[PDB]
Design a binder for this molecule. Structure first.
Ligand SMILES: O[C@@H]1[C@@H](O)[C@@H](O)CO[C@H]1O
Ligand SMILES: O[C@@H]1[C@@H](O)[C@@H](O)CO[C@H]1O
Ligand SMILES: [Ca+2]
Ligand SMILES: [Ca+2]
Ligand SMILES: [Ca+2]
Length: 476
């Protein structure tokens, strides 16, 4: 290259999503040129510092009355869209361009959409960083668009016609199809498959076509659980997909983000690039960065060092899910070994006063001090604990409410800890019992009130003088 401009994103090896020119998912917030100036260069640039490598653009809002007299034709925002294209080009960002809806979400004007893409598909065909998303939420509110009673009918015909237009003028540009508002359950995937089959027959001559440069765009409005199921089922069917709009409503949907990361699916979140948008500002910590930081969510960003490289130790890299009760028994393990703190390093997933593990056991190349334990069950304990040290464990709380939090501890004298969950203090100062020896073990328990979701459990040592074997958490 002779600039930071990114190369064409392509379907990944696993055929789950589009990845960039380094094999990594596209991740990004949104902006709009539907009625405003292009977001300024400096604000677009900031997305790189938030771990993103892509921008979702709602380029123009369709006119429901087109082509009637006084209706607004596509192309009116060209000078603003050109600015977003150039800015993302120079910044080394991907750009996903779509048609927005304004007051008409779950609807479309077919002629307007065809005319939009006749203009814009050739215009950006040669911009390797740019992807085309046919039309935002064109049907109320999800699949099957191909049903005769879809509201409105005929959206698959629009998808087909627009696809033909795009591919005529922009033969190598990634195309994202459907943009389903509500994509949920095994049923949602099955209905989407009817749409896919119909589109495929019309465009490729075979209901079961293997896409080379297309994916299903979908939104998160079925909710994280049902959306995850629909995505899993579609992926099993052999069709890649791409998250193009979702929110926790109100801020990043941490749970859906986690699942998309797990599944290998690119995502565009519904928080905006300053100065303006119709939802929440992605640069305000409370709607994005704090949610990421508190949850323990991590990915490898294209630029910078945020989010920090980190993850769960053991448990197959999955967040440790809390157990529940059925009648009088526990459905899964409640015990998190102290020595199984998140990887990431000193100042990231733990803080240790010395970079060496002086105990030399279990994780000899990290800074936490670990020795063999003679407590019931064997294994290891964290030792050489001093004031200001801390340890983090990424967990996933299944249900909100009261939990018994237990620490398995040993100490010659008294000691003090405090425990945070998602960077919220749940214990205050917790005085720990002197047991009279560093391998004389007791279980200390305090009741805590937890919110549901992915969250870091952080143990803060307010003093030294204790060893820690394990942590247990169970609903009351
Ligand atoms: O379709 C709209 C678009 O016009 C913009 O307001 C972003 O939100 C979407 O729901
Ligand atoms: O944690 C203690 C450490 O402080 C040192 O006293 C050696 O024994 C360990 O168990
Ligand atoms: Ca150490
Ligand atoms: Ca230590
Ligand atoms: Ca242990």
């Amino acid at each position: 290259a002779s600039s930071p401009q990114r190369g064409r994103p392509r379907l990944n090896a696993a055929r789950t999503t589009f990845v960039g020119d380094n094999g990594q998912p596209l991740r990004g917030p949104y902006t709009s040129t539907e009625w405003t100036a292009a977001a300024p260069y400096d604000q677009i640039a900031r997305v790189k510092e938030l771990g993103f490598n892509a921008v979702h653009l709602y380029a123009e809002c369709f006119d429901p009355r087109y082509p009637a007299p006084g209706s607004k034709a596509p192309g009116y925002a060209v000078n603003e869209i050109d600015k977003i294209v150039e800015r993302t080009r120079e910044l080394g960002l991907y750009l996903v361009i779509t048609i927005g809806n304004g007051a008409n979400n779950g609807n479309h004007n077919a002629q307007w959409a065809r005319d939009f893409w006749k203009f814009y598909a050739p215009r950006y065909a040669k911009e390797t960083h740019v992807l085309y998303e046919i039309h935002n939420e064109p049907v109320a509110w999800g699949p099957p668009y191909s049903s005769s009673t879809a509201n409105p009918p005929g959206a698959v015909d629009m998808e087909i016609d627009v696809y033909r237009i795009i591919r005529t003028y922009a033969p190598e540009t990634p195309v994202l199809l459907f943009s389903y508002a509500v994509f949920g359950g095994k049923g949602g995937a099955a209905e989407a498959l009817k749409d896919i089959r119909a589109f495929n027959k019309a465009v490729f001559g075979n209901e079961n076509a293997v896409w080379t440069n297309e994916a299903v765009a979908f939104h998160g409005y079925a909710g994280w659980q049902e959306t995850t199921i629909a995505v899993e089922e579609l992926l099993k069917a052999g069709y890649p997909c791409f998250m193009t709009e979702y929110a926790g409503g109100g801020g990043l949907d941490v749970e859906l983000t986690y699942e998309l990361e797990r599944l290998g699916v690119s995502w565009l979140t519904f928080q905006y690039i300053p100065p303006t948008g119709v939802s929440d500002d992605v640069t305000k910590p409370e709607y994005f960065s704090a949610l990421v930081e508190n949850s323990g969510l991590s990915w490898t960003p294209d630029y910078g060092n945020w989010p920090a490289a980190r993850g769960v130790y053991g448990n197959g890299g999955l967040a440790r899910e809390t157990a529940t009760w059925i009648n009088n028994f526990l459905t899964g393990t409640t015990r998190i070994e102290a020595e199984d703190f998140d990887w990431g390093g000193n100042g990231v997933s733990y803080y240790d006063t010395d970079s060496v593990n002086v105990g030399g056991q279990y994780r000899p190349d990290e800074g936490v001090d670990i020795e063999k334990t003679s407590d019931t069950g064997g294994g290891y304990n964290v030792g050489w604990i001093s004031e200001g040290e801390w340890l983090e464990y990424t967990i996933r709380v299944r249900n909100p409410g009261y939990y018994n939090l237990s620490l398995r501890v040993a100490g010659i004298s008294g000691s003090r800890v405090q425990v945070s969950f998602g960077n919220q203090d749940k214990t205050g100062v917790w005085e720990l019992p002197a047991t009279g020896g560093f391998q004389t073990w007791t279980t200390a328990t305090r009741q805590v009130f937890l919110g549901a979701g992915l969250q870091k459990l952080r143990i803060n040592a307010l003093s030294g003088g204790f060893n820690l074997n394990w942590i247990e958490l169970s609903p009351i």
